[PDB]
Amino acid sequence: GVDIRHNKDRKVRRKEPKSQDIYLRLLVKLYRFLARRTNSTFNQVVLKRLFMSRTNRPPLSLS
Amino acid sequence: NFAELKIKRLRKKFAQKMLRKARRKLIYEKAKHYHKEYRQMYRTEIRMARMARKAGNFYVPAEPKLAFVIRIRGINGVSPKVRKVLQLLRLRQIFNGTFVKLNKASINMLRIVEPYIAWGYPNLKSVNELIYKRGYGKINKKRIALTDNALIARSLGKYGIICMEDLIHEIYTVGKRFKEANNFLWPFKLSSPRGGMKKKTTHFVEGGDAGNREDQINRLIRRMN
Amino acid sequence: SAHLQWMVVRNCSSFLIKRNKQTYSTEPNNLKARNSFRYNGLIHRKTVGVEPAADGKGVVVVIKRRSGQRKPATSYVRTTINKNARATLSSIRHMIRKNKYRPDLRMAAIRRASAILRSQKPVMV
Amino acid sequence: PHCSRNPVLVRGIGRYSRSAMYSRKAMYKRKYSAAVLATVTKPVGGDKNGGTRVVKLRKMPRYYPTEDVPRKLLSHGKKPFSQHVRKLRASITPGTILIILTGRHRGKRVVFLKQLASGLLLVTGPLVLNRVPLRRTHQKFVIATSTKIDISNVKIPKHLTDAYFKKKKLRKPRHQEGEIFDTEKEKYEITEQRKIDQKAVDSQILPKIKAIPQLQGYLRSVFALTNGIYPHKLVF
RNA sequence: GAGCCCCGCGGACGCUACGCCGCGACGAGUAGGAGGGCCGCUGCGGUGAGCCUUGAAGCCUAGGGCGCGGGCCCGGGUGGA
RNA sequence: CGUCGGGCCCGGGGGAGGCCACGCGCGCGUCCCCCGAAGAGGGGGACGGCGGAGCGAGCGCACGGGGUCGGCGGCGACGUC
Ligand SMILES: [Mg+2]
Ligand SMILES: [Mg+2]
Ligand SMILES: [Mg+2]
Ligand SMILES: [Mg+2]
Ligand SMILES: [Mg+2]
Ligand SMILES: [Mg+2]
Ligand SMILES: [Mg+2]
Ligand SMILES: [Mg+2]
Ligand SMILES: [Mg+2]
């Protein structure tokens, strides 16, 4: 046997938008591929920024 | 311009082939030098003792800088301190052996978890058999079988460790990069000792197997792998 | 556009068929009759399809032309081929190889024409 | 076209190293720097059909199965049985007495001639003595005895390949529905070739065996087990 | 000091991207929590040029099978909307 | 004084075996030898990781990125498979 505390093995993070918004799914594909096939972490950050809830994507004021 | 692309591609292929055999020759000659060395300290550890005896005086050898550790107890009902120190030593399984550099701190560590482990000082041949038969490495935290030198140099190269004999030299002759190579190797998952071990509870000195044995670790390894 | 239609119809459609651990779809121009973006016969701006001829003999092939995207009446062109297996197969490979008309469904169409002509051929008892 | 110039002392290892090989084959001096048909054109066959027909071979298939299987990976080993190397048990030498264990001659004692190329054992007996003809047998299904007779200076005719002993089949030519059973060929005839070959090969071993005593009685017997002896304790 | 393939007209599958593929580690569990359920029942909006007196539901069955399982499909019979 | 000690076994010189994953030029260096008529200049050896300037192919054998045979035998309807 092995003594691994298996409670933390599964990291909880968004794999995809929880919505069913069709255009959202499309650009999720687009940027998933982009961040896969490019070395820019900007693409990765935007990709993961397409996933979280509206509460975690607060609206930006103009000012 | 098609023949131009073809000759360029042949250029690249020949360059890589040539580099490959240059590397192969490098590791070949490096292994030859390592063998010439390995003979040397053995011959010395013969001859200074020989010559001190001829002088009638004593020649103590140094305590070995390297030890091999194997765990001999399960995981049921383990005191938190022993459990933690074992997790430090990467001995998370039963029969889950790993190497260790020796010093006062490490020896005190071993004195803490005396009953749950069996250890000693392995020789060259045991190290070779162990590392060849059950050598697995941590690459991207994944246990990958050591089946190619390039797979080694992918991650151990930055310390100059390329061929497998470089690992062996770093290990047996505990060098500058011992910690990195040691942590790189996945802990060795081993069989159960063929023929039993005649006791598991008591310490090795009192007839059991818990604790330390200077050389019989090699007999235990042969019965082990 | 195409990818929209794919995702809007990918799991709800009159032609989609979900059954006991498989999925299929029955669009008129659906090569492989499988619910895929690549083999879908409706969303694609350029689409192929091979079906048995109206009578008991031959193979018809349907090509979606370019200009009539919004007019289904004249969006497709159908021509039936009533020659032997080899010449028809060569012709249909010629369609998509020389026209570059979605040169991915090539041997999918090849296989569908071959199977259609085989089924067409009478069965020995 | 010379030999390898390098004696294999153990498989995979050469008796000399790369530098010695360089010296022996002399690549110090021979160092070199640098350096159909798919379509047959048949005649016209006119007239007014001008233009010879370029007939292409390897015609495109007229049918393709609906699916296929991807090709296997490459194996780098596992050669076909035709060129498997043939191992011989050390206890087996031309002219020992063997004992049959599976075939319809269970327990018979036969004499052992050359080993066939396929690995099968080409053995025979004195048909006149034990009714065992020229017959192939497997080295794994016999027990080797220590009793050896010298069979040097005898001739084994060349036409004794495994192909010669290969079982012949007749059925079923141009018969699909089995209603008239083929009531012939069931009796495997012994063609005269086997007879003459058997006679010629035994004629030279009958007198040789007649020298040492009671070998006739030895070979006539059939091996068996009694409520006493046990095979492991026995010495063959 | 330009050879821009070709005697050929040729060339496996794939990619429901909520898909497919590769690698490693791991797999106990009451109370309790979560996910998936092409598990299941009843009714409604759509959809299957669905099924149905040449036999629906239902029930029976030493019949054949699938699914790890929830269960399901088909054979035979009875039955008659 | 001793070390089947080390110094890529520092080195050199010589004579009727083993080991080398040592073996294109030309030139440039580094070291060594000869005459050295300044112990100058030339003559030669050994080593080099040094220097503007393209490429072996052609067959096999396999302890080589997870098994194949280009091996074979017997039996078959009213009793068996
Ligand atoms: Mg376990
Ligand atoms: Mg748990
Ligand atoms: Mg206990
Ligand atoms: Mg035993
Ligand atoms: Mg206890
Ligand atoms: Mg569990
Ligand atoms: Mg019914
Ligand atoms: Mg020495
Ligand atoms: Mg020297």
Amino acid at C67: S
Strand F contact at CB of residue B6, distance < 7 A? no
Residue C51, both tokens: 């079906």
Residues 56-85 of D with CB under 7 A from strand F: 72-83
Cβ neighbours around B84 below 10 Å, total: 13
Q: Select from A58, A63, A53 the least CA-distant residue to A19.
A: A53
**Distance between CA atoms of residues B78 and B71, nearest Å:** 13
CA of C37 to C1' of E16 (A): 8
Q: Under an 8 A CB cutoff, do D63 and C110 touch?
A: no
Residue C57, both tokens: 């003999």
Question: Distance (Å) from the C-alpha of residue A5 to the closest C-alpha of chain C?
Answer: 36
**Distance between CA atoms of residues B96 and B113, nearest Å:** 15
**Distance between CA atoms of residues C77 and B189, nearest Å:** 67
Question: Distance (Å) from the C-alpha of residue A2 to the closest C-alpha of chain B?
Answer: 5
Strand F contact at CB of residue D18, distance < 7 A? yes
**Distance between CA atoms of residues D24 and D6, nearest Å:** 9
Strand F contact at CB of residue D26, distance < 7 A? yes
The helix-helix angle for C2-9 and A22-37 (nearest 10°) equals 120
**Distance between CA atoms of residues C94 and C79, nearest Å:** 14
Residue B60: strand, helix, or coil: coil
Residues 61-120 of B with CB under 7 A from strand F: none
Nucleotides of F under 7 A from a protein CB: 2-6, 19-24, 54-57, 62-74, 77
User: Going by C-beta distance under 8 Å and a sequence separation of 6 or more, which residues neighbour residue B71?
Assistant: B86, B91, B93, B94, B95, B96, B97, B116, B117, B118
Cα torsion angle, B46, B52, B58, B61, sign: negative
Residue C60, both tokens: 């018809």
- Kind of pairing, strands B66-71 and B98-101? antiparallel
Q: How far is the CA of B92 from the centre of ligand 4 (A)?
A: 28
**Distance between CA atoms of residues B23 and B34, nearest Å:** 16
Strand F contact at CB of residue D35, distance < 7 A? yes
Q: Select from B171, B174, B197 the least CA-distant residue to B185.
A: B171
Taking the C1' atom of every nucleotide in all shown strands and the CA of A25, the nearest one is E18
- Between the two ends of chain B, the Cα-to-Cα distance in Å is 59
Residue D222: strand, helix, or coil: strand
Q: Under an 8 A CB cutoff, do C86 and D59 touch?
A: yes
Residues in chain C: 125
Q: Select from D102, D107, D96, D144 the least CA-distant residue to D226.
A: D107
Q: Ligand nearest B39 Cα, by number? A: 8
Residue pair C106/C82 in contact by the 8 Å Cβ criterion: no
Amino acid at C104: D
Q: Ligand nearest B193 Cα, by number? A: 4
Cα of C24 vs its chain's centroid, Å: 14
Experimental technique behind these coordinates: cryo-EM
Question: Distance (Å) from the C-alpha of residue A20 to the closest C-alpha of chain C?
Answer: 10
Residue A17, both tokens: 């938008």
Stated as kind and residue range, the H or E segment containing D112 is strand D109-115
Stated as kind and residue range, the H or E segment containing B101 is strand B98-101
Stated as kind and residue range, the H or E segment containing D18 is helix D18-25
Torsion of CA D120, D125, D131, D137, to 10 degrees: -10
Chain B CA closest to residue A4: B92
3-state secondary structure D28-82: CCCCCCCCCCCEEECCCCCCCCCCCCEEECCCCCCCCCCCCCCCCCCCCCCCCHH
- Using the structure block, give the residue that is written with the tokens 């042949």: B10
Residue pair C75/C29 in contact by the 8 Å Cβ criterion: no
Q: Select from C93, C98, C84 the least CA-distant residue to C112.
A: C93
**Distance between CA atoms of residues B68 and B124, nearest Å:** 12
Stated as kind and residue range, the H or E segment containing B70 is strand B66-71
Q: Which of C86, C107, C111 is facing D62, going by the closest CB pair?
A: C86
Residue pair A6/B92 in contact by the 8 Å Cβ criterion: no
Strand F contact at CB of residue D180, distance < 7 A? no
Question: Distance (Å) from the C-alpha of residue B134 to the closest C-alpha of chain A?
Answer: 19
* Largest interatomic CA distance in chain C: 50
- Own/partner pairs for B140-144, CB < 8 Å, 24+ apart? B143/B186
Give backbone dihedrals phi and psi of C119, rounded to 5 degrees, phi first: -55, -35
Amino acid at C72: P
Residue D46, both tokens: 């006119």
Amino acid at A54: R
Question: Would you list the DSSP string of D124-143?
Answer: E--HHHH---SEEE-GGGEE
Q: How far is the CA of D104 from the centre of ligand 5 (A)?
A: 65
- Kind of pairing, strands B117-120 and B66-71? antiparallel
Strand E contact at CB of residue C39, distance < 7 A? yes
Structure's resolution in angstroms: 3.2
Q: How open is the CA angle B109-B113-B114, to the nearest 5 degrees?
A: 110
Q: Select from C105, C123, C14, C17 the least CA-distant residue to C61.
A: C105
Stated as kind and residue range, the H or E segment containing B50 is helix B2-54
SS3 content of chain D, % helix, strand, coil (to 5): 20, 15, 65
Residues in chain D: 236
Torsion of CA C30, D65, D56, C61, to 10 degrees: -20
Q: How open is the CA angle D219-D224-D226, to the nearest 5 degrees?
A: 135
Residue pair C66/C74 in contact by the 8 Å Cβ criterion: no
Interface check for A30 against chain C (CB to CB < 8 A): the answer is: no
Residues 57-96 of C with CB under 7 A from strand E: 90, 93-94
CA of C20 to C1' of E75 (A): 20
Peptide bond into D116 cis (omega under 30): no
Question: Would you list the DSSP string of chain C?
Answer: -HHHHHHHHSS--SSEEEETTEEEE--TT-GGG---TTT-SSS-SS-EEEEE-SSSS-EEEEEE-SS-TT-GGGSEEEEEE-S-HHHHHHHHHHHHHHH-SSTTSHHHHHHHHHHHHHHHSPPP-
Residue D7, both tokens: 């004696």
Residue pair B139/B155 in contact by the 8 Å Cβ criterion: yes
Q: What is the CA radius of gyration of chain D?
A: 30
**Distance between CA atoms of residues D156 and D161, nearest Å:** 11
Q: Under an 8 A CB cutoff, do C118 and D63 touch?
A: yes
Amino acid at D214: Q
